[PDB]
Design an enzyme around this catalytic site. Structure first.
Site, short mmCIF file in Angstrom:
data_model
loop_
_atom_site.label_atom_id
_atom_site.label_comp_id
_atom_site.label_asym_id
_atom_site.label_seq_id
_atom_site.Cartn_x
_atom_site.Cartn_y
_atom_site.Cartn_z
N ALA D 99 8.34 -39.54 1.77
CA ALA D 99 9.06 -38.74 2.77
C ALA D 99 10.53 -39.14 2.98
CB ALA D 99 8.32 -38.80 4.10
N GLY D 144 9.19 -41.94 7.34
CA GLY D 144 8.96 -40.50 7.28
C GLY D 144 7.48 -40.15 7.26
N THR D 145 6.71 -40.95 6.51
CA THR D 145 5.26 -40.81 6.44
C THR D 145 4.63 -41.31 7.74
OG1 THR D 145 5.23 -41.11 4.03
CG2 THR D 145 3.16 -41.53 5.18
N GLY D 146 4.96 -42.54 8.10
CA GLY D 146 4.52 -43.13 9.35
C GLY D 146 4.74 -42.27 10.58
N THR D 179 15.82 -51.09 6.86
CA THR D 179 16.96 -50.49 6.14
C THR D 179 17.16 -48.99 6.45
OG1 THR D 179 15.58 -50.30 4.11
CG2 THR D 179 17.11 -52.16 4.24
N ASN D 206 9.24 -54.64 16.13
CA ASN D 206 9.50 -55.60 15.05
C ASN D 206 10.48 -56.69 15.45
OD1 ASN D 206 7.67 -55.10 12.98
ND2 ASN D 206 9.06 -53.81 11.78
N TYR D 224 7.70 -59.37 5.85
CA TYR D 224 6.64 -58.51 6.37
C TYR D 224 5.28 -59.23 6.36
CZ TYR D 224 9.68 -54.30 6.30
OH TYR D 224 10.68 -53.38 6.52
N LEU D 252 -14.08 -47.25 22.88
CA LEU D 252 -12.72 -46.70 22.92
C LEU D 252 -12.37 -45.99 24.24
CD1 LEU D 252 -12.33 -45.18 19.34
CD2 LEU D 252 -11.36 -47.32 20.19
N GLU D 254 -13.32 -46.94 27.16
CA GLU D 254 -13.07 -47.95 28.19
C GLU D 254 -11.62 -48.48 28.18
OE1 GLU D 254 -16.15 -51.00 28.28
OE2 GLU D 254 -15.07 -52.08 29.85
C1 8WR Z 1 21.79 -52.13 0.17
C2 8WR Z 1 20.63 -51.14 0.39
C3 8WR Z 1 19.65 -51.15 -0.80
C4 8WR Z 1 19.84 -51.61 1.63
C5 8WR Z 1 21.21 -49.74 0.59
N1 8WR Z 1 21.25 -49.17 1.80
C6 8WR Z 1 21.80 -47.94 1.69
N2 8WR Z 1 22.13 -47.70 0.47
C7 8WR Z 1 21.78 -48.82 -0.25
C8 8WR Z 1 22.03 -48.98 -1.68
C9 8WR Z 1 22.25 -47.98 -2.58
N3 8WR Z 1 22.20 -46.63 -2.17
C10 8WR Z 1 22.30 -45.56 -3.01
O1 8WR Z 1 22.23 -44.45 -2.51
C11 8WR Z 1 22.47 -45.78 -4.44
C12 8WR Z 1 22.52 -44.76 -5.34
C13 8WR Z 1 22.65 -44.88 -6.78
C14 8WR Z 1 21.74 -45.64 -7.53
C15 8WR Z 1 21.83 -45.67 -8.91
C16 8WR Z 1 22.83 -44.95 -9.57
C17 8WR Z 1 23.77 -44.21 -8.84
C18 8WR Z 1 24.85 -43.46 -9.50
O2 8WR Z 1 25.45 -42.61 -8.86
C19 8WR Z 1 25.25 -43.67 -10.89
C20 8WR Z 1 25.61 -42.57 -11.68
C21 8WR Z 1 25.99 -42.74 -13.01
C22 8WR Z 1 26.02 -44.01 -13.56
C23 8WR Z 1 25.69 -45.12 -12.79
C24 8WR Z 1 25.31 -44.95 -11.46
C25 8WR Z 1 23.65 -44.18 -7.45
N4 8WR Z 1 22.62 -47.12 -4.85
C26 8WR Z 1 22.54 -48.20 -3.99
O3 8WR Z 1 22.73 -49.31 -4.47
N1 GTP Z 2 5.77 -54.84 10.89
C1 GTP Z 2 5.95 -54.19 9.73
N2 GTP Z 2 6.89 -53.21 9.67
C2 GTP Z 2 7.10 -52.53 8.51
C3 GTP Z 2 6.31 -52.86 7.31
N3 GTP Z 2 6.73 -52.04 6.34
C4 GTP Z 2 7.71 -51.25 6.87
N4 GTP Z 2 7.93 -51.56 8.15
C5 GTP Z 2 8.87 -50.92 9.09
O1 GTP Z 2 8.61 -49.51 9.09
C6 GTP Z 2 9.85 -48.80 9.19
C7 GTP Z 2 10.05 -48.00 7.91
O2 GTP Z 2 8.92 -47.15 7.73
P1 GTP Z 2 7.84 -47.29 6.54
O3 GTP Z 2 6.46 -47.53 7.11
O4 GTP Z 2 8.38 -48.20 5.46
O5 GTP Z 2 7.95 -45.78 5.96
P2 GTP Z 2 6.70 -44.91 5.43
O6 GTP Z 2 5.78 -44.63 6.59
O7 GTP Z 2 6.15 -45.65 4.23
O8 GTP Z 2 7.33 -43.46 5.06
P3 GTP Z 2 8.42 -43.06 3.90
O9 GTP Z 2 8.74 -44.32 3.16
O10 GTP Z 2 9.52 -42.46 4.75
O11 GTP Z 2 7.70 -42.03 3.07
C8 GTP Z 2 10.93 -49.86 9.39
O12 GTP Z 2 11.15 -50.06 10.80
C9 GTP Z 2 10.34 -51.11 8.77
O13 GTP Z 2 10.89 -52.29 9.36
C10 GTP Z 2 5.30 -53.95 7.46
O14 GTP Z 2 4.59 -54.30 6.49
N5 GTP Z 2 5.20 -54.54 8.67
MG MG Z 3 7.10 -45.20 2.20
#
Ligand code: 8WR
Ligand code: GTP
Ligand code: MG
Ligand code: ACP
Ligand code: GDP
Ligand code: CA
Ligand code: CA
Ligand code: MG
EC number: 3.6.5.-
Lengths: 309, 53, 424, 437
Positions: D99, D144-146, D179, D206, D224, D252, D254
């Site tokens: 999601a 998104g799923t959660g 993130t 968290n 995690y 449940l 209760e």
């Molecule tokens: C730091 C972290 C993970 C928490 C994080 N938090 C928000 N964002 C991030 C990081 C990224 N987010 C992106 O959206 C991403 C997009 C991505 C990935 C691969 C390729 C190409 C790309 O355009 C290309 C095109 C042609 C040749 C080479 C590269 C873009 N890469 C990242 O490292």
């Molecule tokens: N406590 C705890 N929090 C988690 C864990 N994994 C993810 N989270 C938290 O959950 C949030 C992100 O949602 P996720 O559960 O990763 O997302 P999802 O439900 O898998 O859905 P999508 O990835 O959007 O399809 C953030 O706040 C994370 O810090 C875990 O193992 N333990």
């Molecule tokens: Mg997920």
């Protein structure tokens, strides 16, 4: 480089703290709604205490103690005193007060009514101490800084907010002799500037006229009241172990009667300082409340007493 | 401080201590999942119409 | 969502594109003939993202090599890792595009585009779960600019739900082949605003200045510029090419970086900049990657505000020290990070470092200061367009002046849109 | 007895499920293969642990569990991990494409193509039940799923199983381990749409678990795995009354009666003591007084907030280990006179106590030390509304600029659902203020 925000523009006290912080080179001010602050100089109403201490990697401090309104509103102060066993109904330093919702002389307040006929209804002090020459009433204001560790710091300089009109027993409607506030007077400044007698002069008068001292006759009772009031509420408001920390400046208002007994009138949560004393107090707030939590590159007297029993 | 309704057993016990006395239908869900799919499909049509121009 | 399809278009596209496959093939232990000779299982765990597996356990890049003339694609095949690419994916015309957007987008490139798409379909078919397309090209020439954006438009028609990212090299008078680059770039920017999810604005102005001022190279070649580009392409693909407990695809990353759909032009950066013996400390990586001098798009981030930031640290270091340093720049420069996107700086760490550096950091900045890039190209455009200079090259291939006027207007709107959020 | 089906949705839900079921197996002496020696009625039973486990003729004890995730990689680790034999393949349901931290994509777009399958795999477990109580739903507010898929499931479970109770275990978003930048949107959206369908929900910030792991476990940068093993101790505490012989919180229904008088205000605060490091060489064991007292320290709460500035509608102490009633009463007597415990006028000022003599089980090679006695306090306090205020503020900041909104609308959702959901939350914050001031 520490960061702060300023959410009370009216505050004459924290305007000077804002200024004194900025003029060091180690405190940057931010916009009113920026969440990434070390210090919050906050609003009076609805200060969002739930948003504090949740910004990772920022020690956050605020200049109000949440719950301290229970000492500062007149209605709740009266209820705190009658309900806490550490203060009790038999409290020797609080006037006999009662709560009814919207010598037998009383005073009503929260528009002030002094009569026997007729918010809180409080016993009126019919025989107060009267300064001479003048034959006139006063109230004493003491400023109290409670820091993040709950050290209770009394500021050495207080002030007598004097009346200029001779005190009258029969005539109650004339407010200028009974009510001793700074705004209500402005014979405004006949005996002393702006109806303000500071502690050096008032000590000297007590020495000359009564053969005693401010420290013995009055201040010992003030120190007892301040400490008793704040140690009562300590469990409810203390920010020890808490994810954010609080300090606060209070203004304690007192009345000294003819037999040299001190009475508590009101505690004030957002008090203003007297014109002369801003520079020293506001520097004192920075050293003790703020710089203790955020170190850079004594005017107060500490209230502590551990009697064993 | 009254200790009421004490119930015991071999793995534990429980009690109470009193210090002082005093939904939409399957139609509407399947309807509005599909109404979001209309908007999703209309938006994709607007794009493929734009790319056709 | 694992498989990415890569397309490299034109001279520049294929030059930086080749460098990408050189750098990552080394990082995954793949040799010039496609055979795995690594040691860690982390090198093969998500090798499917960029490589298809062939008979005899050979790895073949999921790469399509596009050009309107053979010259540069002959050079790729002769180059060090040229043999690794699938021969059928070399799709090329003969007559070239003469640094002409119109030739790329409307005449010469129209003739070649469908055969490039057949190869895209061929690669997309045998993809368990296609996450998206990535593209390398310049915006200043003809093929990568005009044809590359035509391809981008076609790919969006056939795959409207897949993510489209670009590394788009922006032209600059400092490193300039022809006077018509601003025209070609302006026509291309309007395509990217509509049809990509992320565009990494590699500015040749910036790459030159980093080579000249901060690397002490008096006469920088395209190799010196492309060395800085390849480090950044490696950097932004780290978190998809490796683990480490981060569960993100291109869409998830895009969702978290792009608050408004047209504002998806990122300002890349890298620390340390090279062309060493002492490894950098975490505070140095952090201060360097946020420094204007290390920006690959010639903008001053103090002239705008950050919408989002991503930063991906590589090497064996303290995650505690990273959190602390990242929080240190935010909390000490908080005016430049918009207060209406809480917690907009996000970070990852990867244990495997790139070849040659004991620790590095790649910076991805979505700042409103990128308007300076678009303002600069818009000024260069108008200087010529107000006298209709060099237009005959384009009107000769069927274009109207109206289309230039439109593209000018679309780019000044983009600039206004950035200005809106800089003051909000 | 009456059976309980656990549903684990999204990454956070799944990985917390793993931890809890690993723990439940150690507590009941059930092994990785699924054999339980101490069980003498082979092939069936109506013991207390059977509320959570079913049985087969070969002697296998099988969780009443469904794991749901829109992408395979997290649930794949359950299929190949230490407890792979435990689960029937039909319980582990996975899509191909997630999601992308988008509520709208989890609820509407990808939710639609998988909701009917999941309800079918849920119906396969409900048909093995002689008397189904209802559901324990594990998920994140931020994913998104959660967020998205959970709210659709919770809508359908009310239709298909209207007579049954539904409990949530909800991970409230913390920037320090997330993130995702759009979690404030996802959290409000799913809270709004899930509210009427959830009878009692236990929120776990968290942020709080993270600082408990730093402060009390001496873990520099908690993973995690660190957080989940601690979360599952709390969950086990809460669910122990459903799995063991006792007279408090036996079903449940209760939980709703004891903790939730006002239905909308169904978010009890969990506080847990003691959390002690296994690496700590010398530990002086804490008493009934000391750990009961620790239940009123904000630093041990699952959500940081201040109970002093707020009012209680209900409070439950769940003790594990060497505890006897009179030590508890003596501890409560000391604590009433020191601390600020104010109840609402219409509720009795009091505590429901539940004691189980078996001390907390700890996962071998884990971070938590063995303890003689532990407690989880469950208090329904208005102070927890602080967490809603924080979340709503962040929502307002972003939403004022329409930041990221296009991603939601692009998946079929209408802009109005944002302000509609936010207004439910505005009312919720107002409901808490009426009760507590
Ligand atoms: C730091 C972290 C993970 C928490 C994080 N938090 C928000 N964002 C991030 C990081 C990224 N987010 C992106 O959206 C991403 C997009 C991505 C990935 C691969 C390729 C190409 C790309 O355009 C290309 C095109 C042609 C040749 C080479 C590269 C873009 N890469 C990242 O490292
Ligand atoms: N406590 C705890 N929090 C988690 C864990 N994994 C993810 N989270 C938290 O959950 C949030 C992100 O949602 P996720 O559960 O990763 O997302 P999802 O439900 O898998 O859905 P999508 O990835 O959007 O399809 C953030 O706040 C994370 O810090 C875990 O193992 N333990
Ligand atoms: Mg997920
Ligand atoms: N019981 C009493 N006996 C004698 N005088 C009294 C009294 N109660 C009030 N007063 C007088 O009335 C004045 C103002 O009343 P009070 O102190 O209750 O409210 P206030 O709000 O004006 C003080 P502040 O604004 O400084 O906090 C005092 O300065 C005092 O002189
Ligand atoms: N950084 C970089 N820029 C290049 C390279 N080759 C060409 N350019 C730039 O790209 C533009 C010319 O486009 P080019 O790719 O040669 O044209 P095409 O083959 O017709 O697409 C000019 O602005 C050049 O500065 C390269 O290898 N590296
Ligand atoms: Ca031709
Ligand atoms: Ca049995
Ligand atoms: Mg060229």
């Amino acid at each position: 480089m520490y960061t702060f925000v300023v959410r009370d523009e009216n505050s004459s006290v924290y305007a000077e703290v804002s200024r004194l912080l900025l003029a060091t080179g180690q405190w940057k001010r931010l916009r009113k709604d920026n969440p990434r602050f070390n210090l919050m100089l906050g609003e009076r109403n609805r200060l969002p205490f739930g948003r504090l201490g949740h910004e990772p990697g920022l020690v956050q401090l605020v200049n109000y103690y949440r719950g301290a309104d229970k000492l500062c509103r007149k209605a709740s102060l009266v209820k705190l005193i009658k309900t806490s066993p550490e203060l009790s109904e038999s409290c020797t330093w609080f006037p006999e007060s009662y709560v009814i919702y919207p010598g037998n002389v009383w005073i009503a307040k929260s528009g002030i009514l002094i009569s026997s006929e007729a918010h809180v209804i409080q016993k009126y002090l019919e025989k107060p101490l009267l300064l001479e020459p003048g034959h006139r009433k006063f109230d004493i204001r003491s400023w109290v800084l409670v820091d993040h560790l709950y050290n209770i710091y009394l500021y050495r300089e207080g002030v007598l907010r004097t009346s200029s009109e001779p005190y009258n027993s029969a005539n109650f409607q004339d407010k200028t002799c009974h009510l001793t506030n700074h705004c209500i007077q402005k014979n405004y400044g006949r005996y002393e500037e702006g109806n303000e007698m500071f502690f050096e002069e008032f000590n000297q008068y007590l020495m000359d006229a009564l053969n005693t001292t401010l420290e013995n006759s009055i201040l010992l009772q003030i120190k007892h009241i301040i400490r008793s009031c704040l140690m009562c509420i300590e469990p409810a408001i203390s920010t020890k172990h808490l994810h954010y920390q609080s300090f606060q400046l209070f203004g304690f208002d007192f009345m000294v009667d003819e037999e040299l007994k001190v009475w508590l009138i009101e505690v004030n949560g957002a008090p203003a300082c007297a014109q002369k004393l801003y520079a020293e107090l506001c520097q004192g707030i920075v050293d003790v409340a703020i710089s203790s939590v955020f170190p850079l590159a004594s005017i107060f007297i500490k209230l502590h007493h551990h009697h064993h029993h | 401080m009254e200790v009421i309704e004490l119930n015991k057993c071999t793995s534990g016990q429980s009690f109470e201590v009193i210090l002082k006395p005093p939904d939409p239908s399957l139609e509407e869900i399947q309807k509005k999942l599909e109404a979001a799919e209309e908007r999703r499909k209309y938006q994709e049509a607007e794009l493929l119409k734009h790319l056709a121009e | 969502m694992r498989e990415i399809v890569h397309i490299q278009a034109g001279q520049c596209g294929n030059q930086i594109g080749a460098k990408f496959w050189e750098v990552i093939s080394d990082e995954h232990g793949i040799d010039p003939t496609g055979s795995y000779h690594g040691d860690s299982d982390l090198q093969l765990e998500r090798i499917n993202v960029y490589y298809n597996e062939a008979t005899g356990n050979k790895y073949v890049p999921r790469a399509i090599l596009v050009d309107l003339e053979p010259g540069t694609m002959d050079s790729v095949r002769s180059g060090p890792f040229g043999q690794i690419f699938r021969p059928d994916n070399f799709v090329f015309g003969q007559s070239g595009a003469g640094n002409n957007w119109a030739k790329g987008h409307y005449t010469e490139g129209a003739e070649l585009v469908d055969s490039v798409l057949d190869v895209v379909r061929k690669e997309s078919e045998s993809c368990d779960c296609l996450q998206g397309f990535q593209l390398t090209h310049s915006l200043g020439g003809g093929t990568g600019s005009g044809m590359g954006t035509l391809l981008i438009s076609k790919i969006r028609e056939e795959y409207p739900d897949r993510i489209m990212n670009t590394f788009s090299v922006m032209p600059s008078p400092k490193v300039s082949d022809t006077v018509v680059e601003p025209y070609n770039a302006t026509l291309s920017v309007h395509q990217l605003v509509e049809n990509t999810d992320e565009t990494y604005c590699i500015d040749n102005e910036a790459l030159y200045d980093i080579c000249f001022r901060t690397l002490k190279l008096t006469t920088p070649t395209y190799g010196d510029l492309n060395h800085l580009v390849s480090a950044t392409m490696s950097g932004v693909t780290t978190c998809l090419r490796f683990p480490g407990q981060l569960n993100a695809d291109l869409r998830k990353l895009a969702v978290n970086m792009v608050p408004f759909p047209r504002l998806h032009f990122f300002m890349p950066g890298f620390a340390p900049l090279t062309s060493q013996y002492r490894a950098l400390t975490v505070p140095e990586l952090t201060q360097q990657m946020f420094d204007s001098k290390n920006m690959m798009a010639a903008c001053d981030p103090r002239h705008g505000r950050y919408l989002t930031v991503a930063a991906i640290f590589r090497g064996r270091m303290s995650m505690k020290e990273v959190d602390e340093q990242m929080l240190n720049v935010q909390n000490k420069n908080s005016s430049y990070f918009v207060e209406w996107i809480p917690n907009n700086v996000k970070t990852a760490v990867c244990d495997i470092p790139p070849r040659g550096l004991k620790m590095s950091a790649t910076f991805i900045g979505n700042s409103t200061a990128i308007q300076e890039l678009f303002k600069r190209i818009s000024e260069q455009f108008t200087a010529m367009f107000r006298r209709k200079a060099f237009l005959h090259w384009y009107t000769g291939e069927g274009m109207d002046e109206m289309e230039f006027t439109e593209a000018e207007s679309n780019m000044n709107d983009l600039v206004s849109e950035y200005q809106q959020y800089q003051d909000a | 007895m009456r059976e309980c089906i656990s549903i684990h949705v999204g990454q956070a839900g799944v990985q917390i499920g793993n931890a809890c079921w690993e723990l439940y197996c150690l507590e009941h002496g059930i092994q990785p293969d699924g054999q339980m020696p101490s069980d003498k009625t082979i092939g069936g039973g109506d013991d207390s642990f059977n509320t959570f486990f079913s049985e087969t003729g070969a002697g296998k004890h099988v969780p009443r569990a469904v794991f749901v995730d829109l992408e395979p990689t997290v649930i794949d680790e359950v299929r190949t991990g230490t407890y792979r034999q435990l689960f029937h393949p039909e319980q582990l349901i996975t899509g191909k494409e997630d999601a992308a931290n988008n509520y709208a994509r989890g609820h509407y777009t990808i939710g639609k193509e998988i909701i009917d399958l999941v309800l079918d795999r849920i119906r396969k477990l409900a048909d093995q039940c002689t008397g189904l109580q209802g559901f324990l739903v594990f998920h994140s507010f931020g994913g998104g799923t959660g967020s998205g898929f959970t709210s659709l499931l919770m809508e359908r479970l009310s239709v298909d199983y209207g007579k049954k109770s539904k409990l949530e275990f909800s991970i409230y978003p913390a920037p320090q381990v997330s993130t995702a930048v759009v979690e404030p949107y996802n959290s409000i959206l799913t809270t709004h749409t899930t509210l009427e369908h959830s009878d009692c929900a236990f929120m776990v910030d968290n942020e709080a678990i993270y600082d408990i792991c730093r402060r009390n476990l001496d873990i520099e940068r908690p993973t995690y795995t660190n957080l989940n093993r601690l979360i599952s101790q709390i969950v086990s505490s809460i669910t122990a009354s459903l799995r063991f012989d006792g007279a408090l919180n036996v079903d449940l229904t209760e939980f709703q009666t004891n903790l939730v008088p006002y239905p909308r205000i169904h978010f009890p605060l969990a506080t847990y003591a003691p959390v002690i490091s296994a690496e700590k060489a010398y530990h002086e064991q804490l008493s009934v007084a000391e750990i009961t007292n620790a239940c009123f320290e904000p630093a041990n709460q699952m959500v940081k907030c201040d109970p002093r500035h707020g009012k209680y509608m209900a409070c439950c102490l769940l003790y594990r280990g060497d505890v006897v009633p009179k030590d508890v009463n003596a501890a409560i007597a000391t604590i009433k006179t020191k601390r600020s415990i104010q109840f609402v006028d219409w509720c009795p000022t009091g505590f429901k106590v539940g004691i189980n003599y078996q001390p907390p089980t700890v996962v071998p090679g884990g971070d938590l030390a063995k303890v003689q006695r532990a407690v989880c306090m469950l208090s329904n306090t208005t102070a927890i509304a602080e967490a809603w205020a924080r979340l709503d503020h962040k929502f307002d900041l972003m939403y004022a600029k329409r930041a990221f909104v296009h991603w939601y609308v692009g998946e079929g959702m209408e802009e109005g659902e944002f302000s509609e959901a936010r207004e439910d939350m505005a009312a919720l914050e107002k409901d808490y203020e009426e009760v507590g001031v």
